[PDB]
Design a protein around this ligand. Sequence first.
Ligand SMILES: [Zn+2]
Lengths: 970, 13
Amino acid sequence: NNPAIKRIGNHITKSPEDKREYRGLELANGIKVLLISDPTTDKSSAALDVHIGSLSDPPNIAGLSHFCQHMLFLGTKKYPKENEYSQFLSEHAGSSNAFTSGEHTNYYFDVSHEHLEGALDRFAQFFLCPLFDESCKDREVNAVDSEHEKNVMNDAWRLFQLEKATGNPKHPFSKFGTGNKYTLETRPNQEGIDVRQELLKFHSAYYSSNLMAVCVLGRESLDDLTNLVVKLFSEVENKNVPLPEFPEHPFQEEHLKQLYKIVPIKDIRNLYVTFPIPDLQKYYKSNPGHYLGHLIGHEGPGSLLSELKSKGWVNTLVGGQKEGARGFMFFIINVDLTEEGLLHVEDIILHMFQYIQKLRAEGPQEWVFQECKDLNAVAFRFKDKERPRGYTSKIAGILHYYPLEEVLTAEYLLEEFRPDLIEMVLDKLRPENVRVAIVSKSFEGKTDRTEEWYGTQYKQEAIPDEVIKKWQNADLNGKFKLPTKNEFIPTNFEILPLEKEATPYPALIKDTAMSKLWFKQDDKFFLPKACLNFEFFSPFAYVDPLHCNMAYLYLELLKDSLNEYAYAAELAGLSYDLQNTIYGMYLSVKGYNDKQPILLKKIIEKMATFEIDEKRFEIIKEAYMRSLNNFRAEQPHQHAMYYLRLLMTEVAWTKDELKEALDDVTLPRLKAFIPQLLSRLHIEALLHGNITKQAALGIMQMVEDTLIEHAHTKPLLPSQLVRYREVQLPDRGWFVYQQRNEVHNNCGIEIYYQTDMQSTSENMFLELFCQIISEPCFNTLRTKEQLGYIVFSGPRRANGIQGLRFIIQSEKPPHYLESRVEAFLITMEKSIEDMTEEAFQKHIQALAIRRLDKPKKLSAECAKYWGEIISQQYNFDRDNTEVAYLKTLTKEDIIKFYKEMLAVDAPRRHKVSVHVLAREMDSCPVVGENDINLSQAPALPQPEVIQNMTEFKRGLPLFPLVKPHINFMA
Amino acid sequence: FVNQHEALYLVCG
Ligand SMILES: [Zn+2]
């Protein structure tokens, strides 16, 4: 029947725990579609993936596909308005984004479930009648240039492009996909090229329905979703475009047995080993590449990493297959490098081949395959319910690789044991097919080449035949042994029955001087999982820079010590996070509840009886020093946020103070520190998931008893549970702190308009206002003015206080950026006064939906509760309470709020600005003074420049702390 | 560990 539908796939295989309904189908024009019905979803979404990417960019216009990606949001014939799409989503609690890879351009969005069609309609036009407006083209080009500019000094991006430039230059893999102003404007201009026309041609030539896949999720029934998609996408024209293929590998003979010495931006030491391999995508039912990745990349006893670490040459290792494109892939083994390791690269590589030889000697093991198969099946069956936006975008992409019926299970459920494929891939991991890259500052001044797109400095050399020979003659090393059965594999998945006293929110079930225990048995996800969060309070974790360094080192040494044992648990879906905080320590264990008690007990026991390995201590200390210094290489806006944090927080040690006190941390000092840190503590925990009250109480008490027995831990005094306050800015005051980024040639800025302490009314005044200015800020400061790629506005919450913040990274100086933000504020005032009552009520409804969006998985609901606990506000019913108050606000309330707290002449304006200057910028005024289609910046007063952070805080009062919400139990 | 864990974006998250 239905001529618009070529076929409706059979039952879509899903997890028996997945209540969502699915329907696969292929439209007449060839678009693969997957419909998902979820009658309970608060937000609906859709995504469309075009199987064409930067690899198909015309040789003379690098980055065109990426540019087309940006341009499609800027207007269509049906919806001409430059921001009709984004504005519509914003006003309906939605969001959107997109990315471009070598063979894909993925577009996606989410929106209130009641406005799926309105959003899908505007979205579908992207692939039917884009405008590619000339004015939008000249402006948006700056956004692309700005995006590339931020990656320029990024080591990951530089290495990513260096690999492409080190392969066959004739191969499309060598293309620069990001593109910039030069390649998208300048170059084409001085070549008589009309980018507008090129975009029209590219889109017309590659945006064919036969190469498109779509996924839509909404509350509507599968039949309604079907008619919806047919009605909006069946008109996409099918030009039967051939799927681009790349059978010849970018790395040919002359590209093998090559060594590269690279100079990084940050002070890092890394060794990258790469092997060219065939495209293994078609073997998804067996995944021979992952099999080898699992073995070679194993941490755990007898692994390559274990020996490499014991020898003090490496700290971390990553192994396995890496995607390339249809026709080719790579197999890598990347490792971290210690100072000693840097001097033994040849030996490290020999060990890599010795381990590989071991795998050849033992041959493929079915029990290993069986183990991964079982774990993958368990993972799929109990997979957490995903957020719509990410789910649709992911499905749209994978619809291009798997049959409709298998789209959900394809990446999880293994079916075939293939020793023939495993051996085939292992046969490619040989010395004569290797590429080795070393990244180190020690190569500074020893390089003779430069990568054009990023300016990366490196040197290329052929690996001497004897070195290759020695690796080829790699023999068995007794230190290398295959892993043993994973004893952490879960077997008990029974869901405990909901207890009679089960509560809607966490309940305080223990309130002692030693610990405060919040508990909630899962009442909606019903998966065999649990989240155990613990907050250990101790004044000695942040008393001074030295102790902060020791707190960090201690936990870092601890995790490094448990790694081998904890890796098996990680594979079995049982992980943990352990880190030092400004108040002590934070520990979180999550995953299948079955064996959590075992891992937890092990962690605490290890914590209270830790014996530091001197060698591990020195190496980890050296890496930490490096990590502190490397912050200088972070982006300008990250620096701005960093400085503001230091400025507004009562107590905060800087990275300079920390590394300065780091040379004072000795093994003896660290050994004395640990017992001191654990001597007195207070624990506030949240146990949430598939667990009973008695199990929770049991877990909590087990942690205390372990500390008491081995560390003789005593309760902390209530008066010692200190919380830091935020600096209280004076009415009508304006302070400016200026610094310079010596790595990035871009400026960064953060403007903070402090309002008042957090509370129901104050919270919603700020949030409603941010909701109203959110899309306009982006549209004005970026799409129109093109100040930069990174343009952000939103609420800032810290230490119980809150306000409005703006974050921008640009080529333009901070004082100019600030003038534009002030001009934008004026625009928003007029805009609010000029908006209709209904438009206002629309923003209220949008914020409401955003705040009431229900978490889809346990960790997300747990995080929300944890947020209430960590902030010590414990307002578990916050969303309902705050939204009810929100729906009470009028335009007048928001106008008054603005005039009293935000306006340039506001009686209670509390403003602080952080100016981060670009590398090649000696100074910059802190304030500055046509009309161009640019609005008028209000005139600003003279700011008080901050010369010393300490003095700044001393001369200002401190806000009080927010009073807790009262939660009564025992 | 195993490598399962590079593209361009319209907008920063
Ligand atoms: Zn982009």
